[PDB]
Symmetry: D2
Subunit: 497 residues, 4 copies
């Protein structure tokens, strides 16, 4: 059979002639019989002194932890990032310091709305998070398979996600929720167009691109900074599943993406992605026709060419999924010297959200979990204690800063980039920023006739279940992007209605 | 559209002609703008003083709680239990005190192995838990849609569940795990035969029966006791889904069971079940040909006739699914005077497991969550504090027993029934108890030729993916039940292989 | 005896004409005998079916929750706030709406460094937090018994607290930690001077003042803003305990403050405080000699006169301490319209810290705990679920914003005050702001000779246990405040050494 | 100064020849400035992008975990147990296999009622828990400084502890609660007598004995069993503190016990205890005049002589108290082959309670915490996952038992000892077992007149604050032990009242 199916057989074969280990309780006490409980006589009641039973059952009763609030369904793999080009003129980050430099990486792919147990081959964006274990600590590039997103302000994120998930009363998917939100928030037009196109359902994780999406900031050795976009293109080529094949596969194999990735790596077909960056100077940022920090916008390639940096290669499968994949945590705020945040409101919100949700989902000391540990860096600070403190807790080192006793010292070279911002400190409305121009270019130039047809068919197929008033407003938005876009969807809706 | 689809529309209409509430933070502070965050100028970074954002995001980051270790995918409804017959000669429980007596109930239906985003229409047993809010506290009859189970000793439960779930490394379903366990533990033959028959995939929750499965004990007003089995048969009739339709539905509508139940209740088609009991005297328990407390055995209806008791009616849908369904907790140990446990090893283990897992999944004070509260009884005791103590914690009442200050007193009439047991206190092996006799009767008499054909096809369709040595041992067990059972499966496996 | 001692006797008497409640399990099942466990025969082992035992023991095993990271030892009480003067020209907050308007309040007093079982009468600042349950949600004024604090930047807070607590290895109080930090961070001179003065150990909670400490912002109906300080002076008069009496009481009655407050309220001696504010216009903020938002500075009374506002009255004792006091949570970020944060770096950090620690200490849904509920306001928003969701979770109301289904709407009038700030976004050092001027005024003008004598004796009595190099550095700081301050301390240290 | 005081100085000196480590965030990113936060200009608000601040503050906000429900205040140390005599004829436990065999141990000493922060030198029993890291897993002998306890049934434990702690309304110690419980439950007479004697306040942890208290069962290589009692007598000699000195020290140094133990070990004065066992054959258990499994009874030395076994030596202090002491967990149920529980109801209850409370206080995977790890044993089983899974989670090993893939196997030689029982499974009352005989022997034969006088004085000094009716019932109990015991106490009470 395939490698995945033969997991146990292979584990057995590796043991070879070795005698089985002694079965023990959690406290390491050998177990005499773990197949029958202790009772008063053959047909008598169970005894409390059967600690073997309680020890095992109590742990079984505690196996589950909360699934991720979004991107719950996924797959993971490990490998490395290798620098192929010199971009030190832009970033001083150690991960990019020299051509040929390899940094270990951990990756998790995922859908967005579905819970654990949902199907892999469904229309939804795809998470493509990368953890770089650098000497300057971990760098988490928490990307998606799209360069943009549905909204441009983080305060609408919980609402958007709610609208994409289950109705609070019925617990069912709700087309009224989905489309009422999107039609009321037309900034979503760009990503909705990409979502409903062919790339809405990639053929597994190896056949899609990855993007940082947000504009980030790079700082060099001289303290000079530029803005950038991260891109990682699949070396296996873009490949998508038709709506029909995706539907069939969601029933035949809900874990299609997990299986495909595991088997590819197990057979030596290590997937790779070519890593690039787009660079925009501060001067160019002032002249960009849109807000360069607006997540619903892309930086046109003809104006901001992709610059090659390196390669991402996945060549190792997880040994224990729960420990290495379910428990892995990526924080966009994990950025080493040379890489910083941009003023993108969405990115700014994410700086808070991830460590926050991880403290809840995993625990206060989630960074102690092996897969999350910045193992290629010495963690030395003034943080102590907390639940499940699994390391030496920094021993007897002086726990306050500053101190006259030789404890860890701050490193001035690691100081962040200083910038002057103008304007009042308040809430600035961005609902009316451009919501259609780049979407028009996508519909007209990025897609061809047959792709536009499928796009309209995909949208109408889902939108038809929303109330007419919602259908009307959604169509009004599409029409504003392009009359052909709106009219084609309307014609399909008429047929359905 | 259907009621479920129109949930929001109906909520809106109910409010109609009245102003929307003021949007507030969790602390009740009115929100001026919850659509834009506070930034340093229109293109500057986010401020910590945007508490509206953090307050909302922090809660979003904490929405998820651990799903149930088993039976994670489900649907809920509410209604009542009504006594139709007098069984006070068997049980003094207040829930049965008089004909016509109505007791409010809460019910949750579910599959077993699949996680929260899995499909409803798959082969698996179905949970059918009933919470009776009685004057003597809550009585939780945590049943399944089958009168039996796969194993007869609780220490094997975690292992059985593990074998039914995901491979620890690949995170994929594993036929080797499933069948290695079942073939090595032939006591599973009886329930495996039922599982792979037509009733393995019921047409929604309204078309299946419910059973307490375990033998329980009933105690009357005179202190006399008998053993019993609880049965609740569908008044809507047994109806199943073909493998083909179940497969199609798992893709078309993974929430088929949830939708079906909600819409039935919303349209006034309240589903009901006729509640019965079988009674076995202590004398009969001594002469029963098998262990009457063996969960892999049924009490033949010819020898132990069904005695009608009342009816279960579900006439109310949940208003908020998370609060009323995801958070509901059923403990088999919640039994009021008149109903007690039997020596069934499986039941004995469950007495511990449920409250234990609930303290983890929900929290130490999970009984304080509205849907879990014994609202028709006054909780008065010496228990105090704990996380999220959401009631006045019994005020200033003396917190130790005994006391001379008028605090709660034990009630002699609530004392449990006493039975004498003799024998060595040790682990008694039950692996070699009868594993085939009742299974033969099911295969030969309960099923007919066409049903036996489908049973063998369903088993072979799944078992064919397990290694040959596993298929062989499995077939050996089936052959022991009946040579036709094993040979038919083998013939089908021969084709597949 | 005193009211506190007679708590149980009074509880008993209050229900003399009633029979005791029936003792039940957590699920409301009546208990027959809660004085003996179930065993097989008189001297046989314990049975798992003794669910009465497990239910009670399991809850006992979960009684404790984490104590507050700081201010762990405290006392609580309830009452009201009454407006007595009109300050609507400064703040539009509903709590100040009309003279005569009463608002319910909850208060918690506490020490700072000591854990839960520590003594009340010890040198340490005193917490004086006030929760106002207003119609515009809860307003939490989390003050101390001092107008200033030891540091002026929140990032040094964890270090400061660590220095004040136990050595990480020995778990003992450490004078080297205390004074190494204070001597290296001389901005602490002002509050250290207050701390070691006679007011360092107040005679209970009723004989001390309360202050918001931080500069806050008030906004009126016209959108005009001013900066303010909150002061609440004791109507019972300032009264302190001598070092000797405090030491004796810490042994005789570690709960002196708790007992004193309870008995005063129980005997009708309701303690009260007169509430005032200081006002500083934005223009005055420009001319202030120091940073008006520097927490180590006060606003001189002659320059900024106290303006009376109202009264704080405590007239109700807690019924259950754990539920109403141990579980109470105050968040400085809970500010209703009309009251806002100032740029005080320390306050800014607290905006994040409290809700954050509360989600940990109490739980994600801590605002649903009765005492923390903004019961005078209707909480309506788009937040849902989370562990121990204790209400109907807002039912079936649409859960995303914006929506076309009548769910909660934002209120523009509640929009925050806009301000333009100048300067780069970076880390500005404040270690070198003035650390001695206001301290000199306190030493020279506020204190008299005998008070200066005790201040020096109190400091020297503790500082004498720190290493000589730490003593030298500390004295150097005190000398900069005033040569007598340092020399008197040095003279005493020479004596101790 | 003393070693404890010079902790930081020594840590600094040990690293004199090294540069300080680089201060990093939790994720290992170097910190440029951890003394000032990022603001909008020098007097502007705080930015969310100051991740250094949030990362540190969020951890500070989560430092605390629930303190132990009982025995919260303590001290810890490490060392070894060395076998000096051969008791293999009684027990096959590997910890006793041969003379000269050393097993690493971890010890925690403590008081009982006081919270963390309470004083060490107060009247209360003292915990003396010993963790033996053996090849057969961990063996936890969770003893006290007394051979007996206040009660003989575990269901009264939560009540007893409640009566010993704070009043639920006032949060104060309550003499009425303490004595109402003790007077109503006279089985407490024996331990109350020990508690109020000179040994009620030992001079530190090194000057007191340790006892397993309960009767345990020892099983040898031939499967033969005997009952036993564990005793570990101080080699430093019994030394107690007077009521006066204890009171003064409770104020001068609440951490007297912690300091004393740390300095003793730091200076090379390693404390030791001589380990003994008492042996009672099953025949003798049948003839014992009292219930040999009654926790309020001792086995007289003349009839059951102490048999030397080995030595407990503490020669290593904790490096980090929180990690090694606050987080240490002892489970009485952690018993290796050769050591088993007896029918003692109290012990039976503790088999459940400890692992249960640990899953709450520390977490589901608390056995993963370094100090709790059975590091001298290979943990191999079918347990998986759970929050904070800090190990490899047993990799890809088959997770179900039985299995055909070479995973861990039960060890028949680890099977527990079988004993036959016969009796009703019910609640047998033990309130009326002998409550005075052994107490009389203590009062009359063990103590002298000088000691009896202090015993009566210590009791009366506390009992005087309980109501008169409680004083009378308590005195009636003491009178039943001996008329002089009651009359002397009554005389002192008369003087006090
Ligand atoms: C020794 C065997 C068993 C053990 C240890 C066991 C354990 C569990 C556990 C730990 C849960 C999760 C509970 C929660 O998180 O709310 C569960 C759920 C469930 N089990 Fe069992 N179970 C066993 C046998 C059975 C049997 C024989 C039945 C039926 C007669 C059954 C019916 C159910 C149902 C219906 C649920 C879900 C209840 C709900 O809807 O919330 N279980 N079981």
């Amino acid at each position: 059979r395939d490698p995945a199916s033969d997991q146990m057989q292979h584990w057995k074969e590796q043991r070879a002639a070795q005698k089985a280990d002694v079965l023990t309780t959690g406290a390491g006490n050998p177990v005499g019989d773990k197949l029958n409980v202790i009772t008063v006589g053959p047909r008598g009641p169970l005894l409390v002194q059967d600690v073997v039973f309680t020890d095992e059952m109590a742990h079984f009763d505690r196996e589950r932890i909360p699934e991720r609030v979004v991107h719950a369904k996924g797959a993971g793999a490990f490998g490395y990032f290798e620098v192929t080009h010199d971009i030190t003129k832009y970033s001083k980050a150690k991960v990019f310091e020299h051509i040929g430099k390899k940094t270990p990486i951990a990756v998790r792919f995922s859908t967005v709305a579905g819970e654990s147990g949902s199907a892999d081959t469904v229309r939804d964006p795809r998470g493509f998070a990368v953890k770089f274990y650098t000497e300057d600590g971990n760098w988490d590039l928490v990307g998606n398979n799209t360069p943009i997103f549905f909204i441009r302000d983080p305060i609408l994120f919980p609402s958007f996600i709610h609208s994409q998930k289950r109705n609070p009363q019925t617990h069912l998917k709700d087309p009224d929720m989905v489309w009422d939100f999107w039609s009321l928030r037309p900034e979503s037009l760009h990503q909705v167009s990409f979502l409903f196109s062919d790339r809405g359902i990639p053929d597994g994780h190896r056949h899609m691109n990855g993007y940082g999406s947000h504009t980030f900031k790079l700082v060099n050795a001289n303290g000079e900074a530029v803005y950038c976009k991260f891109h990682y293109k699949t070396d296996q080529g873009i490949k998508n599943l038709s709506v029909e094949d995706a539907a069939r596969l969601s029933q035949e194999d809900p874990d299609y993406g997990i299986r495909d990735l595991f088997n590819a790596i197990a057979t030596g077909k290590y997937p790779s992605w070519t890593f690039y960056i787009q660079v925009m100077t501060f001067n160019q940022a002032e002249t960009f026709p849109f807000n360069p920090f607006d997540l619903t916008k892309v930086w046109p390639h003809k104006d901001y060419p992709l610059i090659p940096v390196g390669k991402l290669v996945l060549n190792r499968n997880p040994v224990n999924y729960f420990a290495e994949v379910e428990q892995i945590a990526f924080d966009p705020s994990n950025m080493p010297p040379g890489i910083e945040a941009s003023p993108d409101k969405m990115l700014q919100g994410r700086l808070f959200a991830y460590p926050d949700t991880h403290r809840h989902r995993l625990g206060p000391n989630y960074l102690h979990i092996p897969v999350n540990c910045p193992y290629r860096a010495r963690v030395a600070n003034y943080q102590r204690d907390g639940p499940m403190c699994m390391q030496d807790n920094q021993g007897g080192a002086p726990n306050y800063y500053p101190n006259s006793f030789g404890a860890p010292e701050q490193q001035p070279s690691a100081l962040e980039h200083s910038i002057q911002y103008s304007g009042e400190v308040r809430r600035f409305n961005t609902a009316n920023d451009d919501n259609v121009t780049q979407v028009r270019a996508f519909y007209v130039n990025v897609l061809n006739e047959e792709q536009r047809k499928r796009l309209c068919e995909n949208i109408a197929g889902h939108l038809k279940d929303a109330q007419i008033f919602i259908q009307k407003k959604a169509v009004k938005n599409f029409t504003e992007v392009h009359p052909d876009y709106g009219s084609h969807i309307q014609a399909l809706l008429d047929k359905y209605n």
